[PDB]
């Protein structure tokens, strides 16, 4: 049993690369950027029917202008969120201004590598879609991995469905998309890759806009959005 | 090798430190970047890499002071660490001594920081390569940093995958571009050609090209996007 910080002979850190495998098993999550806001959606995927699917929180607020969606070992995400929320509040205490979306992303990724034998014992087993707005670079969507790296995406899907769902987004995404177009498109792609029939109970929508900040859609709103999507499809 | 590469505190029976060597392999997987200098300026050209048609392009150039910067190829997290430590040294020198940190001394400080992680149990070597440029009291400078700890002063070089292309070109054009003094736009072009010799099924665009320059009376500044249009 070698050491957690060990390099492989091909130039990769074992524990980080194994960590990326665990992410592949996670419930799906998708985010889309539009000049009208940014949309985050998640497969809830309850295990038993007795599980109250409201207590399944895979979309969380970081600040009024920054939201986060997770996929992977979700218990590992509690403290990344806690740090992110603290970085958002601290930056405001020190500078009387909202933190930039990328600056908060950079802060989250700095935790990712603080393991060894070096406070944490192992990398995080969870990836993040971080969506937000600031006044320098408008609406933004970022993908943060337990490798410590991150990319800005116009749209990105992580988890079980990702490999295929991403190829879908590369075809469907354009810069003049609207908020409602990306809402449905997130519902669509999710419905294709989930194993259950998607309904307003095993899937969850939410967005971030400058004017209204980050809201998680209540079941009613999402349902009225699922129907509208079933209809646009039957209209072939 | 199996028996001699589970940490940086084990020598191979032939004298190698595999953990350091496996670290260098990460650099070779990074995207190509070039550095070169005249007697008056020093230039970085870097090929930025994206993940999707939908993702951004990973930054490769980092300002360290008004007179010093580097480009990175390899584990980007590690470059953040090292570039941060370099900014700190630049800043300490400025604050305590009212003295700009000499580029040679940055190299020395860098080398020693990295060497700690080839004698440390429980640590790992750094997985990144750095090209450092700056203008100090002894002129223009270009340094090559390797995760082994070896920092080297050169007239030019390139690191990363397919880096040999740019490397051989600079060895060929050497006597020509050293003399490119007092013409920055013409030195950048020299660098842009060198990095071009390293493409394979890819052409430089405004989205993937990134260029930095510094020298006498030209503080280290970074051009991305529309700024780099001029040079293609």
């Amino acid at each position: 049993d070698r050491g957690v910080s060990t390099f492989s002979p091909e130039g990769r850190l074992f524990q980080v690369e194994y960590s990326l495998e665990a992410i592949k098993l996670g419930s799906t999550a998708i985010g889309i950027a539009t000049k009208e806001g940014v949309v985050l959606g998640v497969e809830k995927r309850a295990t038993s029917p007795l599980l109250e699917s409201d207590s399944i929180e895979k979309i969380v607020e970081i600040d009024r202008h920054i939201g986060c969606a997770m996929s992977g070992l979700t218990a590992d995400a509690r403290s990344m969120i806690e740090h992110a929320r603290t970085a958002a509040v601290t930056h405001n205490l020190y500078y009387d201004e909202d933190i930039n979306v990328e600056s908060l992303t950079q802060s989250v990724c700095d935790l990712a590598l603080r393991f060894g034998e070096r406070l944490m014992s192992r990398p995080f087993g969870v990836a993040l879609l971080i969506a937000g707005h600031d006044a320098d670079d408008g609406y933004q969507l970022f993908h943060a991995e337990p490798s410590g790296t991150f990319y800005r995406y116009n749209a990105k899907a992580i988890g079980s469905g990702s490999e295929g769902a991403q190829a879908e987004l590369l075809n469907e995404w354009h810069s003049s998309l609207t908020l409602k177009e990306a809402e449905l498109l997130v519902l669509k792609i999710l419905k294709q890759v989930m194993e259950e029939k998607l309904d307003e109970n095993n899937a969850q929508l939410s967005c971030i806009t400058k004017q209204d900040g980050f809201k998680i859609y209540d079941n009613e709103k999402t349902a009225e959005l699922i129907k509208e999507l079933k209809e646009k499809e039957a209209a072939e | 090798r199996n028996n001699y590469d589970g940490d940086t505190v084990t020598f191979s029976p032939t004298g190698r430190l595999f953990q350091v060597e496996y670290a260098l392999e990460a650099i070779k997987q990074g995207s190509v970047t070039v550095g070169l200098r005249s007697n008056t300026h020093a230039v970085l050209v870097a090929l930025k890499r994206n993940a999707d048609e939908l993702s951004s392009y990973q930054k490769k150039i980092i300002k360290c002071d008004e007179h010093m910067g580097l480009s990175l190829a390899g584990l980007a997290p590690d470059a953040r660490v090292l570039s941060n430590y370099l900014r700190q040294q630049c800043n300490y020198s400025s604050l305590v001594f009212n003295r700009k940190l000499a580029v040679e001394r940055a190299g020395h400080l860098l080398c020693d920081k990295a060497q700690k992680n080839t004698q440390s149990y429980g640590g790992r070597p750094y997985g990144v390569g750095l090209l450092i440029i700056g203008y100090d009291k002894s002129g223009a400078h270009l340094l090559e940093f390797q995760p082994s700890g070896n920092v080297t002063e050169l007239y030019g070089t390139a690191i990363g995958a397919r880096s040999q292309g740019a490397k051989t070109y600079l060895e060929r054009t050497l006597d020509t571009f050293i003399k490119i003094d007092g013409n920055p736009d013409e030195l950048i072009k020299a660098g842009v050609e060198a990095i071009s010799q390293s493409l394979r099924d890819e052409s430089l665009t405004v989205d993937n090209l990134s260029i930095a320059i510094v020298g006498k009376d030209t503080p280290f500044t970074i051009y991305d996007g529309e700024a780099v249009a001029k040079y293609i």
């Binding site: 990769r12 490798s147 790296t149 990319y151 | 990460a26 997987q29 990074g30 995207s31 930025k48 890499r49 994206n50 993940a51 993702s55 990973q58 930054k59 490769k60 990175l72 190829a73 390899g74 584990l75 980007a76 470059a79």
Partner: peptide, 6 residues
């Protein structure tokens, strides 16, 4: 392939 390298 690998896009974990800058």
């Amino acid at each position: 392939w690998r896009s974990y390298y800058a």
